[PDB]
């Protein structure tokens, strides 16, 4: 029976996932009110459940049962609504584009390490992994200096996943979009040089995002940009500190940052699992009797280690090449900001192991702190040994 709040999936989902995929690789569970859902954990069939248009992201299908904005983003629409919200962004995520923001980046990676290099020891979620997605996004959607504190404490609040914490959650939620509108209406105004000012301006067809529309994709462009991101460098910085031999290599060879930051992604899962899907009817996958309503649970961790699509999966290898994981999913939905994922990441890694060759873990295995969510696979804190 998978628990995905209990003890086991919170220390290493990938081994739990895992056993799933070799022994109940399609697995009715009960999502805790109770929901029932469905664990698909081979890669194959992950892929079929990505492309089966039997599988909605909008839960009104199913249902059967303001801050409206946050469930009314593109990731909670079909086709053919989806498909015009992707096309009135995706231009701010062209290949050119956020290329264009390397120079920008390493000198944040830069700051951050002369910060670093104070000291002979750091936290690398606090000090690095953390503040360089965030300076990032500020950065991007032209958040001024001032306001980022503030920035940084709603931005915070407004993804907890404690249940308990609901009205205060909804709280920030709140304050966020008021902070957003007044960008919004100064810049369609005035025009900066950022994304907001970018999407306020945006036309495709004929159509433009209106007020509600901007809301809800800056706020998925927020929440994707600052935890999932981090997640990578932190937990892709604990993949490198455990496998010498790799970041040797990567040290060496700084050539091969492209395909390491491709196997990092793939071995370190950021987002681990994904839901957010229901079956608009009944039918039958494999023998099993998916039902109308029931929701679907992706298992990128476990379909990323599937040894009918990569070769000796449980071990590191940053030049693994080609590299088919789904870190970013597939196909529709396949993510937005993969080329500034990947970017940060470039940077990041080779930065930090070029100031600090000697970098070390300074936590034991079993000491090692994780973030308690579900989906989301993210430390808490991540202390190294820098130098003498
Ligand atoms: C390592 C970092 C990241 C990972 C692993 C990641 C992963 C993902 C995954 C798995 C999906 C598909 C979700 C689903 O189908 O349920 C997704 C979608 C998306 N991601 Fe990311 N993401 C990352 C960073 C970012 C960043 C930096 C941005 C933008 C700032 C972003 C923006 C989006 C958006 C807008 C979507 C929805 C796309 C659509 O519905 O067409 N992501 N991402």
């Given at each position: 029976?998978?628990?995905?709040?209990?003890?086991?999936?919170?220390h290493?989902?990938?081994?739990?996932?895992?056993?799933?995929?070799?022994?109940?690789?399609?697995?009715?569970?009960?999502?805790?009110?109770?929901?029932?859902?469905?664990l698909?954990?081979?890669?194959?069939?992950?892929?079929?459940?990505?492309?089966?248009?039997r599988?909605?992201?909008?839960?009104?299908?199913?249902?059967?049962?303001?801050?409206?904005?946050?469930?009314?983003?593109?990731?909670?629409?079909?086709?053919?609504?989806?498909?015009?919200?992707?096309?009135?962004?995706?231009?701010?995520?062209?290949?050119?584009?956020?290329?264009?923001?390397?120079?920008?980046?390493?000198?944040?990676?830069?700051?951050?390490?002369?910060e670093?290099?104070?000291?002979?020891?750091?936290?690398?979620?606090?000090?690095?992994?953390?503040?360089?997605?965030?300076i990032?996004?500020?950065?991007?959607?032209g958040?001024?200096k001032?306001?980022?504190?503030?920035?940084?404490?709603?931005?915070?609040?407004?993804?907890?996943?404690?249940?308990?914490?609901?009205?205060?959650?909804?709280?920030?939620?709140?304050?966020?979009?008021?902070?957003?509108?007044?960008?919004?209406?100064?810049?369609?105004?005035?025009?900066?040089?950022?994304?907001?000012?970018?999407?306020?301006?945006?036309?495709?067809?004929?159509?433009?995002?209106?007020?509600?529309?901007?809301?809800?994709?800056?706020?998925?462009?927020?929440?994707?940009?600052?935890?999932?991101?981090?997640?990578?460098?932190g937990?892709?910085?604990?993949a490198?500190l455990?496998?010498?031999?790799?970041?040797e290599?990567?040290?060496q060879?700084?050539?091969?940052?492209?395909?390491?930051?491709?196997?990092?992604?793939?071995?370190?899962?950021?987002?681990?699992?994904?839901?957010?899907?229901?079956?608009?009817?009944?039918?039958?996958?494999?023998?099993?009797?998916?039902?109308?309503?029931?929701?679907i649970?992706?298992?990128?961790?476990?379909?990323?280690?599937?040894?009918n699509?990569?070769?000796?999966?449980?071990?590191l290898?940053?030049?693994?090449?080609?590299?088919?994981?789904?870190?970013?999913?597939?196909?529709?939905?396949?993510?937005?900001?993969?080329?500034?994922?990947?970017?940060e990441?470039?940077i990041?890694?080779?930065?930090?192991?070029?100031?600090?060759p000697?970098?070390?873990?300074?936590?034991?295995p079993?000491?090692?702190?994780?973030?308690?969510?579900?989906?989301?696979?993210?430390?808490?804190?991540l202390?190294?040994?820098?130098?003498?």
């Open positions: 029976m998978f628990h995905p709040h209990g003890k086991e999936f919170h290493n989902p990938f081994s739990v996932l895992g056993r799933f995929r070799e022994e109940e690789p399609i697995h009715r569970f009960e999502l805790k009110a109770t929901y029932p859902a469905w698909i954990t081979r890669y194959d069939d992950c892929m079929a459940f990505l492309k089966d248009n599988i909605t992201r909008d839960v009104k299908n199913v249902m059967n049962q303001d801050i409206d904005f946050v469930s009314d983003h593109m990731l909670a629409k079909d086709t053919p609504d989806h498909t015009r919200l992707r096309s009135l962004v995706h231009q701010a995520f062209t290949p050119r584009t956020i290329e264009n923001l390397r120079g920008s980046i390493e000198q944040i990676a830069e700051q951050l390490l002369d670093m290099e104070k000291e002979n020891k750091a936290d690398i979620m606090k000090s690095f992994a953390s503040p360089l997605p965030f990032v996004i500020s950065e991007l959607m958040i001024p001032e306001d980022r504190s503030q920035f940084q404490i709603w931005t915070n609040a407004m993804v907890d996943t404690s249940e308990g914490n609901r009205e205060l959650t909804n709280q920030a939620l709140r304050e966020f979009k008021d902070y957003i509108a007044k960008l919004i209406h100064d810049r369609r105004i005035k025009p900066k040089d950022d994304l907001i000012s970018k999407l306020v301006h945006a036309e495709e067809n004929g159509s433009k995002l209106s007020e509600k529309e901007l809301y809800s994709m800056l706020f998925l462009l927020v929440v994707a940009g600052l935890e999932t991101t981090v997640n990578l460098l937990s892709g910085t604990l490198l455990q496998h010498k031999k790799e970041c290599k990567l040290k060879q700084p050539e091969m940052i492209a395909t390491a930051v491709e196997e990092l992604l793939r071995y370190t899962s950021p987002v681990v699992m994904m839901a957010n899907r229901w079956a608009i009817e009944d039918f039958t996958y494999k023998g099993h009797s998916i039902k109308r309503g029931d929701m649970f992706i298992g990128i961790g476990s379909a990323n280690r599937d040894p699509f990569f070769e000796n999966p449980e071990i290898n940053i030049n693994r090449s080609p590299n088919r994981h789904i870190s970013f999913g597939f196909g529709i939905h396949f993510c937005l900001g993969a080329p500034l994922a990947r970017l990441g470039h990041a890694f080779k930065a930090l192991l070029k100031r600090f000697d970098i070390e873990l300074a936590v034991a079993d000491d090692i702190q994780w973030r308690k969510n579900v989906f989301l696979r993210g430390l808490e804190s202390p190294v040994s820098l130098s003498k």
